[PDB]
Each structure stands twice: as C-alpha cells, then as structure tokens.
Write an enzyme that holds these catalytic residues in place. Structure first.
Site, PDB file in Angstrom:
ATOM      1  N   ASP A 134      37.058  42.890  64.432  1.00  0.00           N
ATOM      2  CA  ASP A 134      38.269  43.368  65.102  1.00  0.00           C
ATOM      3  C   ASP A 134      38.996  44.359  64.199  1.00  0.00           C
ATOM      4  O   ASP A 134      40.230  44.373  64.127  1.00  0.00           O
ATOM      5  CB  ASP A 134      39.194  42.199  65.492  1.00  0.00           C
ATOM      6  CG  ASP A 134      40.214  42.592  66.585  1.00  0.00           C
ATOM      7  OD1 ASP A 134      40.087  43.707  67.142  1.00  0.00           O
ATOM      8  OD2 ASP A 134      41.085  41.765  66.949  1.00  0.00           O
ATOM      9  N   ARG A 138      45.937  48.260  63.811  1.00  0.00           N
ATOM     10  CA  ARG A 138      46.875  47.152  63.875  1.00  0.00           C
ATOM     11  C   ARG A 138      46.515  46.060  62.870  1.00  0.00           C
ATOM     12  O   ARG A 138      47.392  45.299  62.433  1.00  0.00           O
ATOM     13  CB  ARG A 138      46.920  46.592  65.293  1.00  0.00           C
ATOM     14  CG  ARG A 138      45.594  46.031  65.719  1.00  0.00           C
ATOM     15  CD  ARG A 138      45.582  45.510  67.144  1.00  0.00           C
ATOM     16  NE  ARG A 138      44.247  45.000  67.440  1.00  0.00           N
ATOM     17  CZ  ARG A 138      43.350  45.620  68.201  1.00  0.00           C
ATOM     18  NH1 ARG A 138      43.655  46.765  68.817  1.00  0.00           N
ATOM     19  NH2 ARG A 138      42.147  45.081  68.365  1.00  0.00           N
ATOM     20  N   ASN A 139      45.243  45.964  62.493  1.00  0.00           N
ATOM     21  CA  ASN A 139      44.790  44.926  61.586  1.00  0.00           C
ATOM     22  C   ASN A 139      44.722  45.400  60.146  1.00  0.00           C
ATOM     23  O   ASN A 139      44.053  44.757  59.328  1.00  0.00           O
ATOM     24  CB  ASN A 139      43.431  44.392  62.019  1.00  0.00           C
ATOM     25  CG  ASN A 139      43.546  43.429  63.170  1.00  0.00           C
ATOM     26  OD1 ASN A 139      44.637  42.909  63.445  1.00  0.00           O
ATOM     27  ND2 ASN A 139      42.419  43.141  63.821  1.00  0.00           N
ATOM     28  N   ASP A 152      43.050  39.481  59.522  1.00  0.00           N
ATOM     29  CA  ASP A 152      42.585  38.772  60.725  1.00  0.00           C
ATOM     30  C   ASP A 152      41.133  39.099  61.049  1.00  0.00           C
ATOM     31  O   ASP A 152      40.758  39.278  62.202  1.00  0.00           O
ATOM     32  CB  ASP A 152      43.515  39.030  61.903  1.00  0.00           C
ATOM     33  CG  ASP A 152      44.851  38.310  61.752  1.00  0.00           C
ATOM     34  OD1 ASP A 152      45.171  37.887  60.608  1.00  0.00           O
ATOM     35  OD2 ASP A 152      45.581  38.149  62.760  1.00  0.00           O
TER      36      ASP A 152
END
Ligand SMILES: CN1CCC(c2ccc(-c3ccc4c(c3)C(=O)N([C@@H](C(=O)Nc3nccs3)c3cc(F)ccc3O)C4)cc2)CC1
Ligand SMILES: CN1CCC(c2ccc(-c3ccc4c(c3)C(=O)N([C@@H](C(=O)Nc3nccs3)c3cc(F)ccc3O)C4)cc2)CC1
Ligand SMILES: */C=C\C(=O)Nc1cc(Nc2nccc(-c3cn(C)c4ccccc34)n2)c(OC)cc1N(C)CCN(C)C
Ligand SMILES: */C=C\C(=O)Nc1cc(Nc2nccc(-c3cn(C)c4ccccc34)n2)c(OC)cc1N(C)CCN(C)C
Lengths: 288, 287
Positions: A134, A138-139, A152
C-alpha cells in the site's frame, strides 16, 4: 524480539483528537501518561476476538521489529474490544498533505531527497523480505521536513497505485511495490494530484493493458519521467530495483535543477546545516 | 563550528509558561515555529550591550560545541533587546525536584545510575577542559527518569563549593569533583539542602575545621567513603571523574549491597520493553 512491542493498558493512554482514518481504523492524536509521573507524551493511535488477537499480535511483532531511519516502527498495542495500535506521532503529518500545502514553496532539492528516502525505506523492507502492498504518498510520514518515514506496510482498494499483475491477479512482490513507488513519486512531482482522477477504478486495468500511463508531470525532465515509466512496465522483473532507484535519485539530487524545473527554484534551498542541527536536536535524534 | 549555534529572531519563537529562574536569568517553556511552517515545537528559553554580546557569543559557541549523551548542548541564541538562549526542553524537570517528588519510588538502582551518568558527563567536560563551576542537583536535568544530562556549565553556590573555591575563587576540575560529591549527597538524602540552617558566611570555617556533610542513613560506608574523598582538602587527593565512573558502575551491578532503602526490592529499573518504549518517544539519542 517481543520486547519491542509494549503492551499498554487502556488506563495509561487517551485519545484526544482525530487526525484521520485509514486502512483498518481511525487515527487519533494522543498522549502517553507514564505510570508514576505527570508528563503527557504525544503519540498516534489507530483504533481498529481473543484468537484473532494472536493473528494481530503475530503481525504486530513483525511491524514492531523494524529498524531503519526511513521505516516507521510500531511501538505499542492495546487489546480492547476494538484493538488500539500506538506509534510515534509525526507533527508534520504525511507527505501527501505536506506537498499539497507547500506546493508553492517546495524546491527541487527536497523533492528528490524525498524520493531517495522513500527508496531507502522500500529497499529496506525488501531486504527484510516484507512487501508494503500500500505504498502511496499518504503512507509516507514527515518526521522533519528533511526526513520522511514510510508507514502502514505489510497489511495483508488502491487500484490506481497497483501494478497490473496486482489488479488482475492480486500478485504483490517488491517489483509490484516499485510500480506503486512510481505512482508515489508522481504524487510528489505534481504536488498531490489524484492519479487517474475520474476514470473508474474498474476501468484502470483496461487502460494500463492498453498501454496508457500517468502523464509526465510539468516540473519533470524526461530523465525523471523515464524512471517513472520504467516502474510501470507490465513485466515485473523489467522494472528497476529499489536499490537502483536509490543510486539514481541520489545522482539526481547532486544536481537538482538539472532534473526538476520549478518556477522560483533558486529562491528556496535546503536548510543550512545550522538549521538541520537545530531541527535534529529538538525533533530528530535518531541515526540518519 | 558556529553552525552549531542557530541565530534566532524574536519572531520565530515565543515564551509561553514560566518554568523557573536561579542562575543567570529566567527560564520559560516555549515554542519554536519554523519559518514557513505550521508546526509548534516545544523548547526551553533562558531570557537574561553589543560588545558584551561578543563576550556572550564566544562562550555560546563553546556551549554549543558539546557532544555527549550526558551533557546538554546549547542550541540557539536570539541576541535582541534581551539576550535569549534556547535549548531542548526536558519534560521531567531538574533532578533535585525529581528526587524530592518521587522519594516514594526511587530505588537503589536509579540513584547509583544517576551517579554513573553524572560522572560520565563531567569526565567529558574535563576532556574538553571545561570547568563546570556549578555542579549541583538543580543543574542535572531529566530527559527520561533513566537518562540525566548536565546543564548550565562553563559560566554564589557556597554550600556546594570546594574549599579552595570559597577561599581563593579557584575553580579547577578537582573543584568540580567536590561539587560532584555534594551532588551525590543531595541525591542520597532524597533532596535535602546541604548544611541546612547554617549561614553561608560560616561554611568555610566549618570545612577548614574538618567537618563534612553527614553520612546519609540509606548509605553504606562504601558509598560514604567516596563522598568523603571528594571532599578532601588537597584537590589532587580527590578522585578523578574517570575513577568515579568505574566505582559507581561497580556498585550498580549489585545495588542493594551499597544502599539500604526500605521497600527497595519492589522498585527496579524499567524492563527492556519499557526502556525501548521510553526511548522511541522521548530519548532517541545514542545512549
Ligand atoms: C483479514 N483478516 C481480518 C482481521 C485479522 C487482522 C490481522 C492483522 C491486523 C494488523 C496487525 C498489525 C498492524 C496492523 C494490522 C496495522 O494497520 N498496522 C500499522 C499501524 O498500526 N499504524 C498506526 N498509525 C497510528 C497508530 S498505529 C503499522 C504501523 C507501523 F508502525 C508499521 C507498519 C504498520 O503496518 C500494524 C489486523 C487484523 C486477520 C485476518
Ligand atoms: C558580567 N557581564 C554581564 C553580562 C554579559 C553576559 C555574558 C554571557 C552570557 C551567557 C551566554 C551563554 C549561556 C548563558 C549565559 C547561560 O546561562 N546558558 C545556559 C542556558 O542557556 N540555559 C537555558 N535554559 C532554557 C533555555 S536556555 C546553558 C545551556 C546549555 F544547553 C549548555 C550550557 C549552558 O551554559 C548559555 C550572558 C551575559 C557579560 C559580562
Ligand atoms: C496522508 C494522511 C495523513 O497521514 N495526515 C496527517 C498525519 C499526522 N501524523 C501521523 N503520525 C502517525 C500516524 C499517522 C497516521 C497513520 N494513518 C493510517 C493515518 C490516517 C490519517 C491521519 C493520520 C494517520 N499520522 C498528522 O499529525 C499532526 C497530521 C495529518 N494531517 C491530517 C495534516 C494536518 N497538519 C497539522 C499536518
Ligand atoms: C529545577 C527546576 C526545573 O528545571 N523545572 C522544570 C524544567 C523543565 N525543562 C527544562 N528544560 C531545559 C532547561 C531547564 C532548566 C535549566 N535550568 C538551570 C533551569 C532553571 C529553572 C527552570 C528551568 C531550568 N528546564 C520543565 O519542562 C516542562 C518543567 C519543570 N518543572 C516546572 C517541574 C514541576 N512539574 C514537572 C511537576
């Protein structure tokens, strides 16, 4: 090993403000209250059965076991009806919101260094034989503006980041991560744009198979874009390896205005060392 | 060199709550706001002529030049209408107030380690040829309860001073060994004031006479001897900080042998699990 994950009581921490939600629950800003003294220690808290808590803990020990400046580490867990995971709080937020709020003050030297750091973290997860699955702007979290950390990962809906063999066959390798890395850079060079915005997720795979890709961002020379495009080759083994991406973006970081063309680039540069040492003695005491 | 001291503007920081005073000015808890950014960073600020400011900066560059886990480093200065110095904020306060407020849960393993740490920092200052001149439990700050750092060195505290400092304003590192001994005593008496009730003008006469601070009840004779050799009248007879490290470390490997505290077997150091938690939130530096 298992000494890296601290088992927390509900009584010794408290959610105090919502930062957002994500891939298994909601993220809050919190405070840790050490037993026997009064100091509020800021943290980040993700609020998600007894046996499933064994599945949870078995993975939690994995994510609590990482050690790299550019990978985030899971620091605690609290077994409640709904599980609560605790990591260090990054006051600068994620890079996605960062790049979309300073898009008129980011110079070429930061951007390329963010790419290096993300490749460093990713190549580390590769060396640990951990697949992110992922990876996305954003991560990527911002410890200091000179220092980002990936978060994450390893959790086994982001179709517009996925390599084609992940969309068609749920195949997730490090070579599929390199593809999502390619999209992540593209979020950066475009200051936070939504990739393939408005073309339904259901139809992305047909457009990639057709041979369309994300468009060359405006601030990018062909040299940067050609690397993005090699990350999006349909054959996984043909995409570059993260270890190579490190060397390549580092070369481009030694001469940034040659590789990114930003209006006003000569009026925004790196912090002086004076400014980095200040940042580090207050906020960033780890190795690099 | 001078890239170790960041020159600040009044406009990029703000004092927000008064923490205390004492030494050279008033200290506040503050906030640093990076130019062009929206985050607010906690800091500590000491609020105190242009020529005198060159005396200041010359010393400030030295105090910005320390690199040891157990010495504090000066981080910035804002030389405006009032001189304002900036360092990292230690959320646990100074060790003196710590030992006074947590006298209910401080075991022998904590005390003895604080001594090891204070000697480590001091012995580093010696290696840098900086004399503290004001070593004292108040000038020992708490980063975490497992990690103390010395502060406000290189700059009257009569009841901590070696005799040759009271008699001749002579300050060497051997005079710091003495204040080190007095600092230990403050710690082992859980924060008592040395020579409590005696006027300052009379300490020198009692030291020359040959009295010392009295052996604290929780202290074995082995610990008391070290405090006493720190307070010998011949400075070169006192121990070296390198020697104090070894000795207090030896005593920490078997703490209840050397300090006798009631309830001691029910308070131990943090587990590694707890140390790792402490370190990733609060104390990411080397040791
Ligand atoms: C599919 N069926 C459904 C239910 C069962 C299940 C199994 C495993 C989990 C599990 C385990 C561990 C984690 C996560 C999830 C996760 O979301 N985690 C993040 C993380 O915690 N983020 C944070 N933000 C702020 C505070 S905590 C994270 C943090 C980090 F520091 C590094 C990597 C990482 O992934 C860790 C949940 C449910 C199993 C099978
Ligand atoms: C006699 N006439 C009168 C006036 C003139 C003068 C000369 C030098 C100073 C000076 C310069 C620098 C410092 C200090 C003082 C000092 O008090 N400083 C501490 C320190 O900053 N404390 C803190 N608390 C919270 C935030 S800042 C400190 C902090 C640290 F991290 C390490 C060492 C250290 O000494 C630093 C002031 C005035 C000269 C001549
Ligand atoms: C891109 C989304 C985002 O993370 N925005 C964000 C993040 C933080 N700090 C932080 N620290 C640790 C863990 C997380 C975290 C993990 N996940 C899955 C999240 C989802 C949503 C929000 C946070 C998540 N985040 C932060 O700290 C102040 C702020 C922030 N935002 C919304 C920007 C606001 N400015 C003050 C930065
Ligand atoms: C002994 C008093 C004291 O320091 N109390 C204190 C200190 C801090 N943090 C901090 N950080 C850097 C430097 C100093 C510092 C150094 N010197 C010589 C000082 C003199 C006076 C005040 C501060 C000095 N201190 C702190 O951060 C939150 C709080 C605090 N207090 C008020 C202790 C009482 N509560 C914690 C219970």
């Amino acid at each position: 090993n298992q000494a890296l994950l601290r088992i927390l009581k509900e009584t010794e921490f408290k959610k105090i403000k919502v930062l957002g939600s994500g891939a298994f629950g909601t993220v809050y800003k919190g405070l840790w209250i050490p037993e026997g003294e009064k100091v509020k220690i800021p943290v980040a808290i993700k609020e998600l059965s007894p046996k499933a808590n064994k599945e949870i803990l078995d993975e939690a020990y994995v994510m609590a076991s990482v050690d790299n400046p550019h990978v985030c580490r899971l620091l605690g867990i609290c077994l409640t009806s709904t599980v609560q995971l605790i990591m260090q709080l990054m006051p600068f937020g994620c890079l996605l919101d960062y790049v979309r709020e300073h898009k008129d003050n980011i110079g070429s030297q930061y951007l390329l260094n963010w790419c290096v750091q993300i490749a460093k973290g990713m190549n580390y997860l590769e060396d640990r034989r951990l697949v992110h699955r992922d990876l996305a702007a954003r991560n990527v979290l911002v410890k200091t503006p000179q220092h980002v950390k990936i978060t994450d990962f390893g959790l086994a809906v982001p179709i517009k980041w996925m390599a084609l063999e992940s969309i068609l066959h749920r195949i997730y390798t490090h070579q599929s991560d390199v593809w999502s890395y390619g999209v992540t850079v593209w979020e950066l060079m475009t200051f936070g744009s939504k990739p393939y915005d408005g073309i339904p997720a259901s139809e992305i795979s047909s457009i990639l198979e057709k041979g369309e890709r994300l468009p060359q961002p405006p601030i990018c020379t062909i040299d940067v874009y050609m690397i993005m495009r090699k990350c999006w080759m349909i054959d996984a083994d043909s995409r570059p390896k993260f270890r190579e991406l490190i060397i390549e973006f580092s070369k481009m970081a030694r001469d940034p205005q040659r590789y990114l063309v930003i209006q006003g680039d000569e009026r925004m540069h790196l912090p002086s060392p004076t400014d980095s040492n200040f940042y580090r003695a207050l906020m960033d005491e780890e190795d690099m």
